[PDB]
Amino acid sequence: GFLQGKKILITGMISERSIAYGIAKACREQGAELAFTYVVDKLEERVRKMAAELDSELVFRCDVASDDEINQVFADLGKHWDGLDGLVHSIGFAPKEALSGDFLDSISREAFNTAHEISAYSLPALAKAARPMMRGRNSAIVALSYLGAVRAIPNYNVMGMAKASLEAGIRFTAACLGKEGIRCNGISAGPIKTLAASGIADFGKLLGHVAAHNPLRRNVTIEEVGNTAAFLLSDLSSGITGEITYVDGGYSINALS
Amino acid sequence: GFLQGKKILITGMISERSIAYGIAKACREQGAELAFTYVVDKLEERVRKMAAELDSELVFRCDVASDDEINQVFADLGKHWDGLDGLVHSIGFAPKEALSGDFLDSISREAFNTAHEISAYSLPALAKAARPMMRGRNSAIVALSYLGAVRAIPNYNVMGMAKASLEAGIRFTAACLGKEGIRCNGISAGPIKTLAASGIADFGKLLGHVAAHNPLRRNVTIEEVGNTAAFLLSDLSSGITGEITYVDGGYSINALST
Ligand SMILES: NC(=O)c1ccc[n+]([C@@H]2O[C@H](COP(=O)([O-])OP(=O)(O)OC[C@H]3O[C@@H](n4cnc5c(N)ncnc54)[C@H](O)[C@@H]3O)[C@@H](O)[C@H]2O)c1
Ligand SMILES: NC(=O)c1ccc[n+]([C@@H]2O[C@H](COP(=O)([O-])OP(=O)(O)OC[C@H]3O[C@@H](n4cnc5c(N)ncnc54)[C@H](O)[C@@H]3O)[C@@H](O)[C@H]2O)c1
Ligand SMILES: Cc1c(CN(C)C(=O)/C=C/c2cnc3c(c2)N[C@H](C)[C@H](O)C(=O)N3)oc2ccccc12
Ligand SMILES: Cc1c(CN(C)C(=O)/C=C/c2cnc3c(c2)N[C@H](C)[C@H](O)C(=O)N3)oc2ccccc12
């Protein structure tokens, strides 16, 4: 496969419905060796199990709210790996109450700060902590974004501001690290029913809307997202950096439907 | 590889420097079976010889000025192949004098009409002619664009208008064909010293500028473009349609490079 020899760290894999699971599966299918992070101690067993099915025993606790925890991942991983070829950012969070209802009524300073720190700052923070292991390796970062970065969407509210910050982060990270042989790209995925859809009322209606309106007349899968991530983590994509690739079956490019 | 057994028709391969040659070599490396077009009789032997080195003896004349020739390609190819999995558009042309100097002084009606017919109309025209063969196969189209579509660039002049038309054509073709299982995407490549650069003055200066300013601090290769095309032609990219992907080492996303 086209990721033979690559060693890739994957964040955000919490269940088999996670986008990060689709990414991990697609990467392992292409020959990569994987390592994983998980946010709280409570999740360790589930993540070790999924990791084991993908032939990995390399699992590390990481709350991206914590500079120390982020740094410790790379310290620990560096004892097993000579370097890091791929880094997958698949972390997005805002307080649930900020993701329902009128944008201004639902926003607060605290929710804004949390959403941006966890969903956007985490990309430069991870890239910076990974830099010693990634520099000079012709390596690559992939982060997951969503249409709310560039379009107003009902209920997505402050997460759209956070995604816009993330996508600018992708550009600035790519501009910073390209000379030393690290690429940084985004995927803007169409909606997928993961654990992110939990408590998001009418997610089903969103899915039906996208499948009724997009060129492919269907919703995307975690496999389709994951195969695109695999490509972006591979040397096949060596001419691409700072890019946001839409894996939404063409949804964003249609109007007047 | 990930195009094993896929049948792909490639336009625009005229030398080993061509973008289309990079795409061909990348697709063959992933297992595809290839077929090729050439614009005029003068080129037939060169392209047949290149094709043979890529394990193909399927080569067809096609000047995209001619609807007869465009549709004749697929009639002839259809005698060999029961269907088509991939279609590569790597064709761009404007009169040389329209590509030098002041945009308005250099433009003319004839040059505008030629640039748009050859460089933009040829994408829907080829997609339309290929539709019967490509239908229902989870097949894919890839076309080459350039940053002039979306940014003003010295000397590129009317070709920028033609590339804008082309990129809209990619979106409209994607929206048209998606229900029938055909995807259509673009690659916006960084500058490359192909035969296209011949007769373009100071092309080396343009290359130097891009390598000085882009995130990667280097120009891209036809191999990099080709591997992206291979991905976009494959089922790995089945969630992507109507997209323009920049293979320019990040050049387009940088500013204020002093
Ligand atoms: N599901 C969709 O429709 C969709 C579409 C496009 C983009 N996205 C984005 O894709 C990414 C993955 O989401 P998903 O849908 O797979 O959901 P998911 O809930 O499976 O994954 C989100 C992950 O973020 C992690 N996370 C949250 N806070 C964290 C913290 N402080 N530190 C570390 N990890 C933390 C969670 O533990 C979880 O693993 C997110 O960035 C999301 O915004 C989702
Ligand atoms: N070289 C660059 O810097 C660059 C960067 C981005 C995009 N592009 C685009 O890539 C494509 C391929 O160009 P290239 O750089 O590989 O140069 P090239 O000269 O190798 O290929 C151009 C091709 O266009 C064909 N063509 C011209 N008029 C035609 C006609 N009437 N019918 C059929 N074919 C015709 C030529 O015969 C040739 O094969 C073009 O669309 C070009 O605009 C080039
Ligand atoms: C699409 C789409 C998505 C799916 N999507 C594109 C996302 O980025 C989701 C992000 C998200 C962030 N924080 C959460 C989320 C999801 N969900 C539950 C509640 C989680 O436990 C939590 O407490 N915070 O999320 C939406 C939210 C509103 C409107 C549309 C969408
Ligand atoms: C980059 C860049 C490119 C390279 N590029 C991105 C192109 O699309 C080139 C297009 C092209 C079209 N018609 C031609 C061309 C090139 N060259 C010779 C003369 C050919 O034989 C002919 O008679 N017409 O071309 C440029 C032209 C001007 C400014 C910048 C660029």
TrEMBL record, chain B:
It catalyses: a 2,3-saturated acyl-[ACP] + NAD(+) = a (2E)-enoyl-[ACP] + NADH + H(+). NAD(+) binds at G12, S18, I19, D63, V64, I91, G92, K163, I192, K193, T194, L195, A196. Pathway: Lipid metabolism; fatty acid biosynthesis. The keyword Lipid biosynthesis applies. It is an enzyme of class 1 (oxidoreductase). Keywords: Fatty acid biosynthesis, Fatty acid metabolism, Lipid biosynthesis, Lipid metabolism, NAD, Nucleotide-binding, Oxidoreductase. Its EC number is 1.3.1.9. One of its GO terms (biological process) is fatty acid biosynthetic process. The active site is at Y146, Y156. Substrate binds at A94. InterPro entries: Enoyl-ACP_Rdtase_NADH, NAD(P)-bd_dom_sf, SDR_fam. Pfam families: adh_short_C2. NCBIfam families: PRK08690.1. This is Enoyl-[acyl-carrier-protein] reductase [NADH]. It comes from Neisseria gonorrhoeae (strain ATCC 700825 / FA 1090). The lineage of its organism: Bacteria, Pseudomonadati, Pseudomonadota, Betaproteobacteria, Neisseriales.
